[PDB]
Design an enzyme around this catalytic site. Structure first.
Site, PDB file in Angstrom:
ATOM      1  N   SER C  42       3.135  -3.666   8.536  1.00 28.33           N
ATOM      2  CA  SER C  42       4.079  -4.435   9.329  1.00 28.33           C
ATOM      3  C   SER C  42       3.808  -5.933   9.305  1.00 28.33           C
ATOM      4  O   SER C  42       4.587  -6.686   9.894  1.00 28.33           O
ATOM      5  CB  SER C  42       4.054  -3.946  10.779  1.00 28.33           C
ATOM      6  OG  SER C  42       4.438  -2.580  10.906  1.00 28.33           O
ATOM      7  N   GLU C 140      11.121   0.050   5.970  1.00 29.94           N
ATOM      8  CA  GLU C 140      10.390   0.833   6.958  1.00 29.94           C
ATOM      9  C   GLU C 140      10.954   2.254   7.012  1.00 29.94           C
ATOM     10  O   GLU C 140      12.176   2.433   7.024  1.00 29.94           O
ATOM     11  CB  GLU C 140      10.490   0.194   8.341  1.00 29.94           C
ATOM     12  CG  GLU C 140       9.553  -0.983   8.569  1.00 29.94           C
ATOM     13  CD  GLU C 140       8.238  -0.567   9.208  1.00 29.94           C
ATOM     14  OE1 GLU C 140       8.272   0.190  10.200  1.00 29.94           O
ATOM     15  OE2 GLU C 140       7.171  -0.996   8.722  1.00 29.94           O
ATOM     16  N   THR C 209       0.410  -7.671  13.680  1.00 27.13           N
ATOM     17  CA  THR C 209      -0.423  -6.564  13.232  1.00 27.13           C
ATOM     18  C   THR C 209       0.260  -5.789  12.110  1.00 27.13           C
ATOM     19  O   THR C 209       1.455  -5.936  11.845  1.00 27.13           O
ATOM     20  CB  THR C 209      -0.747  -5.620  14.396  1.00 27.13           C
ATOM     21  OG1 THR C 209       0.468  -5.085  14.936  1.00 27.13           O
ATOM     22  CG2 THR C 209      -1.498  -6.359  15.489  1.00 27.13           C
TER      23      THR C 209
HETATM   24  C1  LIG Z   1       3.535  -1.558  11.053  1.00 32.49           C
HETATM   25  O1  LIG Z   1       3.044  -2.023  10.057  1.00 32.49           O
HETATM   26  C2  LIG Z   1       4.008  -0.095  11.114  1.00 32.49           C
HETATM   27  C3  LIG Z   1       4.894   0.826  11.489  1.00 32.49           C
HETATM   28  N1  LIG Z   1       4.790   2.258  11.279  1.00 32.49           N
HETATM   29  C4  LIG Z   1       3.528   2.964  11.080  1.00 32.49           C
HETATM   30  C5  LIG Z   1       2.670   2.917  12.334  1.00 32.49           C
HETATM   31  O2  LIG Z   1       1.424   3.129  12.292  1.00 32.49           O
HETATM   32  O3  LIG Z   1       3.210   2.669  13.441  1.00 32.49           O
HETATM   33  C6  LIG Z   1       3.986   4.398  10.796  1.00 32.49           C
HETATM   34  C7  LIG Z   1       4.394   4.534   9.310  1.00 32.49           C
HETATM   35  C8  LIG Z   1       2.949   5.496  11.148  1.00 32.49           C
HETATM   36  S1  LIG Z   1       5.441   4.564  11.880  1.00 32.49           S
HETATM   37  O4  LIG Z   1       6.942   4.082  11.364  1.00 32.49           O
HETATM   38  O5  LIG Z   1       5.248   5.084  13.231  1.00 32.49           O
END
Ligand SMILES: *C(=O)/C=C/N[C@@H](C(=O)O)C(C)(C)S(=O)O
Ligand SMILES: *C(=O)/C=C/N[C@@H](C(=O)O)C(C)(C)S(=O)O
Ligand SMILES: *C(=O)/C=C/N[C@@H](C(=O)O)C(C)(C)S(=O)O
Ligand SMILES: *C(=O)/C=C\N[C@@H](C(=O)O)C(C)(C)S(=O)O
EC number: 3.5.2.6
Lengths: 265, 265, 265, 265
Positions: C42, C140, C209
């Site tokens: 992210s 995403e 983050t």
């Molecule tokens: C940020 O970089 C991330 C978003 N998603 C990950 C997370 O750890 O929250 C996943 C892929 C596990 S998610 O879309 O919940």
């Protein structure tokens, strides 16, 4: 009269407010349109989880459920990422409470099993908690889209409150099953701008939100006082006048809850 | 009938509670013991900084003030750490508000000049702001321990709520000065458990606390509803029956502030 | 020989660690696996917002973007509550940084426009800043789950650290835009346990983050000494040896930061 | 190495820095000017209350001590508000730790009893903890203003660490007494801008500060890692080149504690 303030917010937000706080030994019950029917929407996923918990032993959670692309029908932030792997019943409880995952709900409903995806099995479970009013007839997301005046997929701030009192405060589940449900609700991620936003920070708040068409917005919660006293809060609302695509007003729920806090302090 | 809830708190805590909230175009004024005298304690430091600001050009804040060991007569968490360097009028303003620093308040009172270290001068600034009842007769820490019934160093919730209103919300100050006092109070570090604790977290709260013997605990504040409406809340209390050594109950203040919050939503 | 401490943490957390801090005038550059590739996760949402900001006037932020249920494909704590009302381009920027909302980042990528949801565009914006190494090939949540060794959706602590230096400390954005990005990153809510946890509190920390599968855990930040010296800190880690489901270790990031903090003091 | 950062700050702050962290099982000993003598200043009050604790039973705390205006000779924020009433031994402990009250220290010394306000008694309790080096010869405030080079009223960053290790981490006091000392040091109110400001916020920090002429600034603390490992940190510093009224530089101490934190992570 607290009701005048509850009848002011309606006019202010142009909505229909329902509130119910079950009376304690020290406090009277709070009632506003308490026995009027409001749509469950996603709030039925709380008693849905406790149902599966109640009929099945702790090991049932590690059962894996597989599904396909056609099974994803409503907002499903968790289910869309495990279509290839599948999810264990426990994960679908976590997705259904904390993130209001629609698919996990429909699946947990099928896990109850029976007619029309085991909706009847669900109402049935509500009848053994002494609730004869509530009912669930559709699945996600149709249950959110029933027109006003229709009694399908409806509940009452009076009837859901007591259900949540039985489930979190009472003996409806054994403690080790009651422990899991509470935690999932304490870590819910969708109720920030509702009941959680109207109670002071040093109050504890677990909740399950509900949203839908006709400006429907619900949050059912169990909040704890800074001295540890528990109460159950039910706030349900809709804005049918605005029509099908009216916008739900979260601030109404947060403002309502603050009124409850004032009387509960 | 919010007065019943306030009278219930007095019983619960063995205290005397005083609350005032000036009227607003939408709402009526809230009053409990609003015209009774309570002890200023360290709430006099907010209008004390106003008076200093008021009579001086902004440049005066840089004026360095030096002091000696015999000046630190009460708790002075900041001034105690600058006895060799000295402090500017600004750093004394910051400390007297944010850390309720005792020595800061006495040096400020002195900078006001005149009889009795400037207590008389302070009271005249309150008379000029219309305040007809308040009075400051002594310095820190004596002004905190006057016996009950003694009218010296006392104000009223009604009186101070109106001064605070004019200093922050009104025009008693020019914008460039008013903006300093508002900031200092916005960053107060001694009232996390009082009015701040009874109001939800989406309400902005700026306050100045006060604490003294005979279980005295006050807190004066300006609050901004999430929508932006500002309110002034004066909460004062004592437990003079328990005697000199009686223990302040900060939870009383927070609970009353939660009661005021429901009424103001 | 700060590279001995970093390696000891790698051994201790069973992880690969990457660290970059660009050189300031007073200090040298801190490097560990600096030029190695780590998954974006992210952390790409920070330059992405800067991308949208750069290509559009400030009033473009009031454009209303409406979406549907199908668009909620990963966790989207804000987007999921506004399906009815729709979100503005300002609100999407807010939620992509502060809550790392997934649906908001995907929408913004579309607002960038171009091939495959605007990932070619996001990349091209990086190429205009000087970054010839990073790349964004997915959306995403697919961009979080690339297998180790693959270069899709990756950057390098060196490369990202310089992008963030231009966007915030340099002039890649005019002051009025820049200040919006700086403010959003200052009010982040997902980085309490990472770099923020590794610096003393009197250092100001803004950050975004990154988390994904294979125990991926990143955090990029700008930090300000108590005297006001800015530094950029790029920390990235994975644990791809423990497989897809490996648990990330935030405390590795909060500890590395504590090492960088001592050297910068 | 870490010694070259410690010789930088000296130059940066124009001071003489002394650091000592006793080695643990997992870490080695940090040493910089560790055996060079620095003025006790107000850090002797840490071992002082332990001495009173040690040779008296817990009930000796309730003993009352009356005094007069002529006894108030140093910064005495708490002792000056009890001339009339008097103080118990325990209040003189709490006051002398948390607020560094000078009068309360000189009374505790006199409670230990013996020659010249009982200073010999104090050193008489240090040797029994193995400290052959340190010494106390005067009372507040003279012990703070002995000239540079003189050896009266001095300890060393090595010699006072191992006393604070025994006195908090060892068996120098029984637990009952241990508990009180520790608590008073975790509630100190004079050390926010020193060691406490240089360690991250998830590290626990207990300390007793010391400040005096010739720019003398000390702090001794026991800090706990986020995982629970304790450490003893002794930072002491003076600026003897700038004369009697040289300004003490708290920032040096915070920076040195941040430098200690980096290797310890
Ligand atoms: C940020 O970089 C991330 C978003 N998603 C990950 C997370 O750890 O929250 C996943 C892929 C596990 S998610 O879309 O919940
Ligand atoms: C939870 O059970 C569902 C709520 N549905 C709404 C939502 O905000 O998520 C709709 C109306 C958007 S939906 O059924 O997709
Ligand atoms: C012990 O607590 C020390 C006090 N010393 C100095 C201080 O700044 O606190 C003085 C200058 C007040 S002193 O020589 O008493
Ligand atoms: C101003 O009135 C505030 C605080 N002072 C009191 C306190 O409770 O701390 C005193 C006077 C008791 S004090 O020793 O600071």
């Amino acid at each position: 009269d607290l009701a005048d303030r509850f009848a002011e917010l309606e006019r202010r937000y142009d909505a229909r407010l329902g509130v119910y706080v079950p009376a304690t030994g020290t406090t009277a019950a709070i009632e506003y349109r308490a026995d009027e029917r409001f749509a469950f929407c996603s709030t039925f996923k709380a008693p849905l989880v406790a149902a599966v918990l109640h009929q099945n032993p702790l090991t049932h959670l590690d059962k894996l459920i597989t599904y396909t692309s056609d099974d994803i029908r409503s907002i499903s932030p968790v289910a869309q990422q495990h279509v290839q792997t599948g999810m264990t019943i426990g994960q679908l409880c976590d997705a259904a409470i904390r993130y209001s995952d629609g698919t996990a709900a429909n699946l947990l409903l099928a896990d109850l099993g029976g007619p029309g995806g085991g909706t009847a099995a669900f109402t049935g479970y509500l009848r053994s908690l002494g609730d004869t009013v509530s009912r669930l007839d559709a699945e996600e997301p149709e249950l959110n889209r029933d027109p006003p005046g229709d009694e399908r997929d409806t509940t009452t701030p009076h009837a859901i409150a007591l259900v949540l009192q039985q489930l979190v405060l009472g003996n409806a589940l054994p403690p080790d099953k009651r422990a899991l449900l509470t935690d999932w609700m304490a870590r819910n991620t969708t109720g920030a701008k509702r009941i959680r936003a109207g109670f002071p920070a040093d109050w504890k708040v677990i909740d399950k939100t509900g949203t839908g068409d006709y400006g429907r917005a619900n949050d059912i919660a169990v909040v704890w006082s800074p001295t540890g006293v528990p109460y159950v809060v039910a706030v349900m609302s809709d804005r049918a006048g605005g029509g099908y695509d009216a916008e739900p007003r979260e601030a109404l729920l947060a403002e309502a809850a603050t009124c409850v806090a004032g009387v509960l302090a």
